[PDB]
């Protein structure tokens, strides 16, 4: 049984959360068919999606909207989730009180699932989740202690074994909460482990539509972390998920002829070039960003689910 009852309090002023939400060509308070895009570590919304799902979702008939939690998704993943929860509240009312899809890149999927686990109000407002390379179990490649012995808050949190990923799993968050499709790759160079095509993989959610590219395209098919978001294969799976009456991608809607690892066909030449360079700003943001030597404390609503772990203030207690 998941957390129920009232939503946790926000730590951020609402005005700050509002400033992080933008829609292309519309206000989030008056928008037709919004899709909420949640970016990856080290990026803003436009950096994650300008070269891919902002144009691609527009051509499918959605108004692209996004959050850009500062600085570049490097702060506390629990604060990044406040931006998403506030955005869902706003876009739900702003689209006529209609459920909306959420589409994510890397950490953005962890944020979405964290929000669905701990903020019950949004469960009735999210139609489906389409997550590209989500790291629900974190990654064994996060490397918070590689090179400098300090790393961004959200990098600690995305490290395998972290208090945050422990709390998500222990609270029941590795089972899908809304209809979810997870698209990922065994050759992801950022998120591992992803090789088993099974619940061991970081992108896997129980009862989700878990699509490891190599299970469809073969063991030597190669797409990396950025290509998991931008590829033509990824587009076909995401399109199926967004159109599906079940809320999940359908195996019938894609196949071996879609196994194209290059940027999605419908992107402009400029977008395809930008898609190849997707993570370049992320490295600069990380170098310039906040860094610390400990994992951020869990907020009170999550503390009971990671008792015994160690965060900045000490040992987690209930």
From Swiss-Prot:
MF GO annotations: triacylglycerol lipase activity
GO aspect biological process, one term: lipid catabolic process
InterPro entries (alphabetical): AB_hydrolase_fold, Stereospecific_Lipase
EC number: 3.1.1.3
Glycosylation sites: 75
Catalytic activity: a triacylglycerol + H2O = a diacylglycerol + a fatty acid + H(+)
Enzyme class: hydrolase
Top-rank taxon: Eukaryota
Active site: 106, 188, 225
Alphabetic keyword roster: Cleavage on pair of basic residues, Disulfide bond, Glycoprotein, Hydrolase, Lipid degradation, Lipid metabolism, Signal, Zymogen
Function: Hydrolysis of triglycerides. Is very stereospecific both in hydrolysis and in organic synthesis and has a potentially important application in glucolipid synthesis.
Protein name per the record: Lipase B
Organism: Pseudozyma antarctica (Yeast)
């Amino acid at each position: 049984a998941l957390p129920s009852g009232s939503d946790p309090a926000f730590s951020q002023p609402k005005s700050v959360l509002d400033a992080g939400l933008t829609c292309q060509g519309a206000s989030p308070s008056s928008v037709s068919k919004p899709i909420l895009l949640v970016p990856g570590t080290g990026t803003t919304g436009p950096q994650s999606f300008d070269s891919n799902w902002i144009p691609l979702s527009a051509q499918l008939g959605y108004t692209p909207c996004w959050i850009s939690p500062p600085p570049f998704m490097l702060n506390d993943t629990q604060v990044n989730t406040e931006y998403m929860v506030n955005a869902i509240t706003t876009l739900y009312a702003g689209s006529g009180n209609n459920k909306l899809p959420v589409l994510t890149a890397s950490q953005g999927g962890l944020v979405a699932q964290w929000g669905l686990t701990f903020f019950p109000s949004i469960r009735s407002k999210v139609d489906r989740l389409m997550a590209f390379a989500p790291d629900y179990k974190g990654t064994v490649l996060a490397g918070p202690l590689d090179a400098l012995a300090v790393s961004a808050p959200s990098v600690w949190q995305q490290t395998t074994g972290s208090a945050l990923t422990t709390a998500l799993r222990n609270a029941g968050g590795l089972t899908q909460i809304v209809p979810t499709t997870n698209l990922y790759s065994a050759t992801d160079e950022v998120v591992q482990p992803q090789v088993s095509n099974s619940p061991l993989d970081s992108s896997y959610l129980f009862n989700g539509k878990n699509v490891q590219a190599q299970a469809v395209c073969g063991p030597l098919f190669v797409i990396d972390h950025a290509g998991s978001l931008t590829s033509q294969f990824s587009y076909v799976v995401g399109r199926s998920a967004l159109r599906s009456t079940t809320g999940q991608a359908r195996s019938a809607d894609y196949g071996i002829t879609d196994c194209n690892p290059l940027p999605a066909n419908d992107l402009t030449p400029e977008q395809k070039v930008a898609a190849a360079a997707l993570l370049a700003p992320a490295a600069a943001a990380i170098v310039a960003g906040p860094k610390q030597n400990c994992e951020p404390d869990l907020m009170p609503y999550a503390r009971p689910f990671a008792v015994g772990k160690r965060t900045c203030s000490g040992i987690v207690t209930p």
